[PDB]
């Protein structure tokens, strides 16, 4: 009967809460009390990247820590050389309503998508000296929010369908489909070993997925509004989330727990981005109040502010060698900090 | 200094910057619009993932987008105007239409965007009022006390019982507009009949007033 199935949910939902309080003996703040504070972090702008003519929505770093890609609402993708501020390529787009970027680990392809419900792949290293479209992936019924290359032949996407997918690029077909969210999915991040990933949706929930099997393993719920950004810890055993309720939270995989909270009494705007440092001691967040904050991940006290933009910050990222950080904004500028 | 190859890459970059400037100049003379309306409203017959449309009037280009909501509405934070279409013939769904207009008018990302409101299908409204089978007062009780104000512009060949019906519905939309707007953006109403040919001219005239307010606000006259 329908009623009997509903009752089992209450029996199994309350049993999980019991198994969470049993494992909660001490807190992260109590253990980390006898550690010296980080200090006062002072960073300064080193480069300013100009040439876009509209709002900037996404960026991603190349794996050599010198090249990066950016998307804007003028229908252009641009590839930059960070050391000299030279422009390498400028790719024109068919649809101007883009929302995401991705750069391949080898460096031969870039990807973009948006409110047209299609993920496009571009070939960068060909004869006849031109970047040209190599594949168009169709099958979603809503807009694309995120995409991250898994390999030179696999890509993972998230949509406003309440669905994620895994594609084989050569064939152009969906290999697996991930279901379970009740709201639009806004972000995904991959594990260092590239065998798991996490996602966050408008239902105030976060989920951990298995690439090979196609199932959902864990579900985390502590927020009170939409989740906009997500990122793994370098170890691969934790991740961080940022919401419209003006908070950041840290979750642990092996305990199914929320470990720490990052909030202040005079911050009332939402989060747009999160990113970790190389050792995982600083947590970087972008806000709607036009600047960014630098948190101590182990003690939850602020350490600095990056304040140089005159519109909201929309994207963020740290290099693979830990040497620099970049920001984009609705004011059509990119800045590298150090 | 700079090496020979590092000097040729710099000359390549300037040619990219040069081309990025012509496209920005062409894009500055096209006006962008967004189309909204649930259904039963005749959006697709107003001007004769995303569908697009283009038209020209007095040597000015227009570009109109319909998407077929609280998440992707941020993208349209800088359009010139929003076109909202309502069917005013069936009385069972106005309260749903009024709730929709209220959420768009009171959105955080749309606090500088004006709205051109189209009340469509006024030929069917006249038939329902004249026939007398359905009564507006059943759904909106305060219709009994309403009466036409002293500024009755109404057209030559209308029954006064049809003017009363149509001036009541328009007040229900302007009351929300003037409720809490702080004067930073306004609403323009119109009456249409799904066979009229003068709607592209009416969008052109309203967009000329919207730009005028931006002009005399940028140069501090207000």
């Amino acid at each position: 009967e329908l009623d009997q199935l509903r009752q089992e949910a209450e029996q199994l939902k309350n049993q999980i809460r019991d198994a969470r309080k049993a494992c909660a003996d001490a807190t992260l703040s109590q253990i980390t009390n006898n550690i010296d504070p980080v200090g006062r972090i002072q960073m300064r702008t080193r480069r300013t990247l100009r040439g876009h003519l509209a709002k900037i929505y996404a960026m991603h770093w190349g794996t050599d820590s010198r090249l990066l890609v950016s998307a804007s609402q003028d229908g252009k993708l641009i590839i930059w050389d960070s050391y000299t501020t030279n422009k390498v390529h400028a790719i024109p787009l068919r649809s101007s309503w883009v929302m995401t970027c991705a750069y391949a680990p080898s460096g031969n392809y870039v990807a973009c998508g948006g409110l047209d419900n299609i993920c496009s792949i571009y070939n960068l290293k060909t004869r006849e000296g031109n970047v040209r479209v190599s594949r168009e992936l169709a099958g979603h019924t809503g807009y694309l929010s995120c995409c991250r290359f898994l390999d030179d032949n696999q890509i993972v996407t998230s949509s406003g369908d309440t669905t994620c997918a895994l594609w084989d690029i050569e064939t152009g077909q969906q290999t697996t489909t991930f279901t379970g969210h009740t709201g639009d999915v806004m972000s995904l991040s991959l594990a260092p070993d590239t065998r798991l990933f996490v996602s966050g949706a408008c239902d105030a929930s976060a989920k951990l997925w298995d690439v090979r099997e196609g199932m959902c393993r864990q579900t985390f719920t502590g927020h009170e509004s939409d989740i906009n950004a997500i990122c793994f810890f370098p170890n691969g055993n934790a991740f961080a989330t940022g919401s419209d309720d003006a908070t950041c939270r840290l979750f642990d995989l092996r305990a199914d727990q929320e470990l720490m909270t990052y909030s202040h009494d005079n911050i009332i705007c939402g989060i747009t981005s999160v990113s970790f440092s190389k050792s995982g001691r600083l947590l970087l967040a972008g806000y709607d109040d036009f600047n960014c904050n630098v948190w101590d991940a182990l003690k939850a006290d602020r350490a600095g502010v990056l304040a140089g933009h005159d519109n909201r910050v929309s994207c963020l990222g740290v290099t693979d060698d830990g040497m620099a950080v970049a920001t984009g904004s609705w004011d059509s500028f990119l800045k590298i900090w150090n | 200094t700079v090496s020979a190859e590092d000097k040729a890459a710099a000359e390549r970059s300037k040619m990219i910057d040069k081309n990025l400037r012509e496209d920005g100049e062409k894009a500055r003379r096209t006006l962008r619009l967004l189309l909204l309306g649930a259904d039963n409203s005749g959006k697709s017959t107003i001007v004769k993932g995303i569908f697009e449309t283009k038209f020209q009037v007095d040597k000015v280009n227009f570009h109109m987008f319909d998407v077929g909501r609280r998440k992707w509405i941020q993208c349209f934070n800088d359009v010139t105007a929003i076109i909202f279409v309502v069917d005013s013939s069936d009385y069972n769904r106005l309260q749903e239409a009024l709730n929709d207009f209220k959420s768009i008018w009171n959105n955080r990302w749309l606090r500088t965007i004006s709205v051109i409101l189209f009340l469509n299908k006024q030929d069917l409204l006249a038939e329902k009022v004249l026939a007398g089978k359905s009564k507006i007062e059943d759904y909106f009780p305060e219709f009994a006390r309403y009466t036409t104000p002293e500024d009755a512009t109404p057209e030559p060949g209308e029954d006064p019982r049809v003017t009363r019906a149509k001036y009541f519905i328009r007040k229900e939309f302007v009351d929300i507009s003037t409720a809490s707007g702080d004067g930073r953006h306004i609403c323009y109403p119109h009456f249409t009949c799904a066979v009229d040919t003068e709607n592209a001219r009416r969008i052109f005239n309203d967009c000329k007033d919207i730009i005028l307010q931006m002009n005399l606000r940028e140069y501090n006259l207000v």
Partner: single-chain antibody
Framework: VQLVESGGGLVQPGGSRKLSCSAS????????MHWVRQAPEKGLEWVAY????????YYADTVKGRFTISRDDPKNTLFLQMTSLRSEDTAMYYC??????????????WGQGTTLTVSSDIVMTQATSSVPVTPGESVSISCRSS???????????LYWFLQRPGQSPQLLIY???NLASGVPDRFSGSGSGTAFTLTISRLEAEDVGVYYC?????????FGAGTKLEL
């Protein structure tokens, strides 16, 4: 990709001539172009350069004031105009493409040639001139520069070329370490400032010819003398 040269023949001393190069198969306007010539029994030599967008032109000293280089992007053609021809200008002329950005590889494609018969600088030398080799062995070639080719940005600007009998040269290595597209894995180049080497492992046939070293710090661009490999 194709490049076809026209013009060339028998000219009396003091005369004039015009050469043409027509491209097909690639985006001609995004590339730079070079002219390179080869004396009937001697080695390679650089003549002139035109830039993408036509904003930079360079000439060699032996031709400056006599030759003129021009391009016509809509018609996909390249020109070279002569004046006051002497007997030192009897050679075969090549048409070369090159593109410059981060991670690029200039001097990829060389066309065929046309024959014309008329009736301070960085010097670098390849000491050896001939080497007898047998299949299945391992060989090394050496090039030595005058001043250092290593820049303050960490780049060493040295190139390697191979010209098979009866054919036009092709690229093997760019910037002293990088292997070009289509070249087998047995080729590998190393070296330091002012000393360079190239290594061939498991030598096979169709690898016999002349090998050239070139520098790209400064203009003019200078070549070596060559190194035969015979059976």
């Amino acid at each position: 990709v194709q490049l076809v040269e026209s013009g060339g023949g028998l000219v009396q001393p003091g005369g004039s001539r015009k050469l043409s190069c027509s491209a097909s198969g690639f985006a001609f306007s995004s590339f730079g172009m070079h002219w390179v010539r080869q004396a009937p029994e001697k080695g390679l030599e650089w003549v002139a350069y035109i830039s993408s967008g036509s904003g930079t032109i360079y000439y060699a000293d032996t031709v400056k004031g006599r030759f003129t280089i021009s391009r016509d992007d809509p018609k996909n053609t390249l020109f070279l105009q002569m004046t006051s021809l002497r007997s030192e200008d009897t050679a075969m002329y090549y048409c070369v493409r090159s593109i410059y950005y981060y991670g690029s590889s200039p001097f990829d494609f060389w066309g065929q040639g046309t024959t014309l018969t008329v009736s301070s600088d960085i010097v670098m030398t390849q000491a050896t001139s001939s080497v007898p080799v047998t299949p299945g062995e391992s060989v090394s070639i050496s090039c030595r520069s005058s001043k250092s080719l290593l820049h303050s940005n960490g780049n060493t600007y040295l190139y390697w070329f191979l010209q098979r009998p009866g054919q036009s040269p092709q690229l093997l290595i760019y910037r002293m370490s990088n292997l070009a597209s289509g070249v087998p894995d047995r080729f590998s180049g190393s070296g330091s400032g002012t000393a360079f080497t190239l290594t061939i492992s498991r030598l096979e046939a169709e690898d016999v010819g002349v090998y050239y070293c070139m520098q790209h710090l400064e203009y003019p661009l200078t070549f070596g003398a060559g190194t035969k490999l015979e059976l």
